[PDB]
């Protein structure tokens, strides 16, 4: 109940929201149907429009007008944004040449530059170039401030997940807004864009910027605007708040625009009708900047222009229907569209089985336009599994497509020409970032980055301590003139052992064999030196990874590779090796095909054994350092050590062997040498974080050998490819992957063909940031380079996307 009989007199767009049943005058009161009776009259004035004209200049104040052109308007803070231009001979902000803002130039009583976030729904990254002729204010922000060619949204590339990620620095799985529609089985409640459930606080996890600010004594403008409040009024309200006395004035503000998304759905991302919404958004930016200029704040405020996601061409005719695949379509609930999420229609139906649904959805049609996944098998880069609101079955839909349950859903709910929600690496889903103001750099282009990074920077801009989040704080220091955050590298928690030769061959009873019984003082000292680390400079190029948790492990040196061998997991945590452009690929010789050799540096008790693999009919093994890339016939024996062996399903061995035999040498040829670090990952509870021992769900049959859920590789070379990877003077270049360790290749519909037709496609889908691997392994890479630590943090958040 609302007692809408109070009044909004002197309360229009009040900051503190009052409690029911007292009526509200805040910018969201319309959304709650709780505004006081006179809210429209007093707070939503429209009379005479939004612009001064010549005849209005110096007018007598009429309180009824939307904005003012009287002499008193400046001290009242409520002039039309073009007042000084029309009436005082001033220029529009956009017509002024840009001049570097070297220091904040702020009016007295301003304690810090205010931050204004100007957020635009559905603003596709390529609109910055393609619409630049019709967006002169935005183009000035872009060219004069700091910009990225695009900013990567989070998956799913929907509005609510991305807006809340922007505000929190969190992945959707952590902040809890995992879709625009959700069902939470614990609450037994549904979240929808329409309706009241979405205002319940229990949906919204983490800590958004406006709460971080308030908790630390920084006043925030309300970030949200009821849809019926026109943009011009949103701007005037922000400019009015900026005129408040110092003790009442917010330091952070947000504007939100439902455009160009609204029109993009109707017309497609580049429909001819899209020009007008882009002009309109530019005009709104113009009003803000002219308004700031009138307040003498245009060289004081940091302005962020940022989108939530892009927009793709999608029409009704490009819809896959689950009724064309499933016998039992009425026994499931689908959350449809540009991603699919499936669960049981009834929790009472015990005939429901996700395995038979996945199978019925797998490679059934030649050009099938979605792919089914159990959520834990989705590419780890999406970070889209660790939440009870994310259904176990997920459909990754091809760009330009929809999935629906039955045809009647699509013509009983063609209209639209645009949509979004797809995989966040899809080019059409990329969005925009521009920062302009004293704290941002001048005329600086920065590489693309992920929106999860911005919360930290917005906290930096406001002098706030960020709540714990998924950004990597310092990775965006290159955007900033000042307020940089200078982190220290984490401290190593476990130091390695460096074992020498401690065991005789006969102490091992591993059931392994190797034909290595075939035989020099020149060359004997040489191989001893290799075991002591004499080639380590070649193969460990950026220092050894640091282990950031408590464990027992050994550094093992070899001619061709170095490893950190875990006594607890019976395998390396990491294996590091460098392959020059000149390296040659060889085969596994016949007499060594089934060779596994005891490692006399590591006890039988801390070793794998071959008998376990013999007995486990499902499980085979592979090697982390590939025997194919041995530097010599004699060094090749090192590659068959039991301490280089890892458990691998035969289906996975197809992928791995092609990566090792063919792809590594290809990358070395193309990149002028590569350094490779490979290893296992164990993430049985799909939380994106390293499992402890007691979380491991699967072992090689009969043994204590844990089975990895994933295998990673980090592939580093010189950004200047005229220099070899191992003699690089400047910035690095990296690509990485986290490949799912699966007992079939059902994910790859073409896997019956030669690995040259499907393996690299699989690896591209599972591309990763070094930072993703760090979370999953508890390791910290690149500890010893010549490079600045912030530069290294940027490198660690890099994602190689393979979008051309
Ligand atoms: C991305 O960044 C984020 C933020 O840094 C990372 O997430 C953090 O990860 C931590 C480890 O997983 C986690 O720490 C845990 O905190 C538990 C208490 O958490 C509550 O309080 C905090 C602080 O206010 C709050 O943020 C939490 O909010 C979550 O839950 C609410 C309500 O459910 C949601 O609204 C909200 O969205 C959020 O949900 C997300 O996180 C939870 C996990 O907390 C998930 O389950 C959800 O799916 C969702 O993703 C909470 O309100 C605390 O209980 C934990 O302690 C256990 O483990 C420790 C290890 O130190 C152990 O010593 C303890 O004994 C304890 O175990 C006991 O409980 C077990 C489980 O019930 C039980 O089995 C045992 O027997 C024990 O009794 C733990 O310390 C932190 O909460 C989250 N934070 C957030 C915001 O998500 C994330 O990891 C990053 N991602 C990547 C890939 O790097
Ligand atoms: N109609 C609206 O006004 C409306 C409605 C729903 C909104 N969200 C949906 C999920 C969370 C809130 C927002 C978003 C506000 C917002 C503005 C700027 C932002 O970028 C940042 F964080 F960088 F500041 C982040 C969030 C605005
Ligand atoms: Ca949106
Ligand atoms: Ca885990
Ligand atoms: Na086997
Ligand atoms: Na297949
Ligand atoms: Zn949309």
From Swiss-Prot:
Catalytic residues, chain numbering: 159 (nucleophile)
Family (UniProt): Belongs to the nucleotide pyrophosphatase/phosphodiesterase family.
Job description of the protein: Secreted lysophospholipase D that hydrolyzes lysophospholipids to produce the signaling molecule lysophosphatidic acid (LPA) in extracellular fluids. Its major substrate is lysophosphatidylcholine. Can also act on sphingosylphosphorylcholine producing sphingosine-1-phosphate, a modulator of cell motility. Can hydrolyze, in vitro, bis-pNPP, to some extent pNP-TMP, and barely ATP. Involved in several motility-related processes such as angiogenesis and neurite outgrowth. Acts as an angiogenic factor by stimulating migration of smooth muscle cells and microtubule formation.
Disulphide-bridged cysteine pairs: 8-25, 12-43, 23-36, 29-35, 52-69, 57-87, 67-80, 73-79, 98-144, 106-300, 316-414, 363-749, 512-610, 514-595, 718-728
Enzyme superclass (EC): hydrolase
Domain SMB per the UniProt entry, residue ranges: 4-47, 48-92
The UniProt record lists the keyword Lipid metabolism: yes
A Gene Ontology term for the protein's cellular component: extracellular space
Gene Ontology MF, one: phospholipase D activity
Positions of region (Required for secretion): 773-794
Assigned EC number: 3.1.4.39, 3.1.4.4
Cofactor binding summary note: Binds 2 Zn(2+) ions per subunit.
Organism this protein belongs to: Rattus norvegicus
A Gene Ontology BP annotation from the UniProt entry: cellular response to estradiol stimulus
Keywords from the UniProt entry: Calcium, Chemotaxis, Cleavage on pair of basic residues, Disulfide bond, Glycoprotein, Hydrolase, Lipid degradation, Lipid metabolism, Metal-binding, Obesity, Repeat, Secreted, Signal, Zinc
Protein name in UniProt: Autotaxin
Glycosylated position list: 3, 348, 360, 470, 750
Residues annotated for 1-tetradecanoyl-sn-glycerol 3-phosphate binding in this entry: 159, 180, 261, 420
Activity regulation (record text): Inhibited by vanadate. Inhibited by micromolar levels of bile salts, such as tauroursodeoxycholate. Not inhibited by taurodeoxycholate. Not inhibited by hydroxysterols, such as 7-hydroxycholesterol, testosterone, dexamethasone and prednisolone. Inhibited by EDTA and EGTA.
Tissues in which the protein is found: Abundantly expressed in cerebrum and cerebellum. Localized in secretory epithelial cells in the brain and the eye including choroid plexus epithelial cells, ciliary epithelial cells, iris pigment epithelial cells, and retinal pigment cells.
Site (Essential for catalytic activity) location in chain: 796
InterPro entries: Alkaline_phosphatase_core_sf (IPR017850), DNA/RNA_non-sp_Endonuclease_sf (IPR044929), Endo_G_ENPP1-like_dom (IPR001604), ENPP1-3/EXOG-like_nuc-like (IPR020821), His-Me_finger_sf (IPR044925), Phosphodiest/P_Trfase (IPR002591), SMB_chordata (IPR020436), Somatomedin_B-like_dom_sf (IPR036024)
């Amino acid at each position: 109940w609302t007692a809408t009989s109070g009044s909004c007199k002197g309360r229009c767009f009040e900051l503190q929201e009052v409690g029911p049943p007292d009526c509200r005058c805040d910018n969201l009161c319309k959304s709650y149907s709780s505004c006081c009776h006179d809210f429209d009259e007093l707070c939503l004035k429209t009379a005479r429009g939004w612009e001064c004209t010549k005849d209005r200049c110096g007018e007598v104040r009429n309180e009824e007008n939307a904005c003012h052109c009287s002499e008193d308007c400046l001290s009242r803070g409520d002039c039309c944004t073009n007042y000084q231009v029309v009436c005082k001979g001033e220029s529009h902000w956009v017509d002024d040449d840009c001049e570097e803002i070297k220091v904040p130039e702020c009016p007295a009583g301003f304690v810090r530059p205010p931050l204004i976030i100007f957020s635009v729904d559905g603003f596709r990254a390529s609109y910055m170039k393609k619409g630049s002729k019709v967006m002169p204010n935005i183009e000035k922000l872009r060219s004069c401030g700091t910009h990225a060619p695009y900013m990567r949204p989070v998956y799913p590339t929907k509005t609510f997940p991305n807006l809340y990620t922007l505000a929190t620095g969190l992945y959707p799985e952590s902040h809890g807004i995992v879709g625009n529609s959700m069902y939470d089985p614990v609450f037994d409640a549904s979240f929808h864009l329409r309706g009241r459930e979405k205002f319940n606080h229990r949906w919204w996890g983490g800590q958004p910027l406006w709460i971080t600010a308030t908790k630390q004594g920084v006043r925030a403008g309300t970030f949200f605007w009821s849809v019926s409040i026109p943009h011009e009024r949103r701007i005037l309200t922000i400019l009015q708040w900026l005129s408040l006395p110092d003790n009442e004035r917010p330091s952070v503000y947000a504007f939100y625009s439902e455009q160009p998304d609204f029109s993009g759905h109707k017309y497609g991302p580049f429909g001819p009708e899209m020009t007008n919404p882009l002009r309109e958004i530019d005009k709104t930016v113009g009003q803000l900047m002219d308004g700031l200029k009138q307040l003498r704040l245009h060289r004081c405020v940091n302005v962020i222009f940022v989108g939530d996601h892009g927009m793709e061409d999608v029409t009704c005719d490009r819809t896959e229907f689950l009724s064309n695949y499933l016998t039992n379509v009425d026994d499931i609930t689908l959350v449809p569209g540009t991603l699919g999420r499936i669960r049981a229609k009834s929790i009472n139906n015990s005939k429901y089985d996700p395995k038979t649904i996945i199978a019925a959805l797998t490679c059934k049609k030649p050009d099938q336009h979605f792919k089914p996944y159990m959520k834990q098998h989705l590419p780890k880069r999406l970070h889209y599994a660790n939440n009870r609101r994310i259904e176990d079955i997920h459909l990754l839909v091809d760009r330009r497509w929809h999935v629906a349950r039955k045809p009647l859903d699509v013509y009983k709910k063609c209209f639209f020409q645009g949509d979004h929600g797809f995989d966040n690496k899809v080019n059409s889903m990329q969005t925009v970032f521009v920062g302009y103001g004293p704290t941002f750099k001048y005329r600086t282009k920065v590489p693309p980055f992920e929106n999860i990074e911005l919360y930290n920077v917005m906290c930096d801009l406001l002098g706030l301590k960020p709540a714990p989040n998924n950004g990597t704080h310092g990775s965006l220091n290159h955007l900033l003139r000042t307020n940089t955050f200078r982190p220290t590298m984490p401290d190593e928690v476990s130091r390695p052992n460096y074992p020498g030769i401690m065991y005789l061959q006969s102490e091992f009873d591993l059931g392994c064999t190797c034909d290595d019984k075939v035989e020099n003082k020149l060359e004997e000292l040489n191989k001893r030196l290799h075991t002591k680390g004499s080639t380590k400079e070649r193969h460990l190029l950026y220092g050894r990874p640091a282990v950031l948790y408590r464990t027992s492990y050994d550094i093992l040196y070899h001619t061709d590779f170095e490893s950190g061998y875990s006594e607890i997991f019976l395998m390396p945590l990491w294996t590091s090796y460098t392959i020059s452009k000149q390296a040659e690929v060889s085969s596994i010789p016949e007499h060594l095909t089934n060779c596994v050799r005891p490692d006399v540096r590591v006890s039988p008790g801390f070793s794998q054994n071959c008998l376990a693999y013999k007995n486990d009919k499902q499980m085979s093994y592979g090697f982390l350092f590939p025997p194919y890339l041995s530097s010599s016939p004699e060094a090749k024996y090192d590659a068959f050590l039991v301490t280089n062996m890892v458990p691998m399903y035969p289906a996975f061995k197809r992928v791995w062997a092609y990566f090792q035999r063919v792809l590594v040498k290809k990358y070395a040829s193309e990149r002028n040498g590569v350094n490779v670090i490979s290893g296992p990952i164990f993430d049985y509870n799909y939380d994106g974080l390293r499992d402890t021992e007691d979380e491991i769900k699967q072992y090689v049959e009969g043994s204590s050998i844990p089975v990895p859920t994933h295998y990673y590789s980090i592939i580093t070379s010189c950004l200047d490819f005229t220099q070899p990877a191992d003699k690089c003077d400047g910035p690095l270049s990296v690509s990485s992957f986290i490949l799912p360790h699966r007992p079939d290749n059902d994910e790859s519909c073409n896997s019956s063909e030669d690995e040259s037709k499907w393996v690299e496609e699989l690896m591209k889908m599972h591309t990763a940031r070094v930072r993703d691997i760090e979370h999953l392994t508890g390791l910290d890479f690149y500890r010893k380079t010549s490079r600045s630590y912030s530069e290294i943090l940027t490198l660690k958040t890099y994602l190689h996307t393979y979008e051309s």
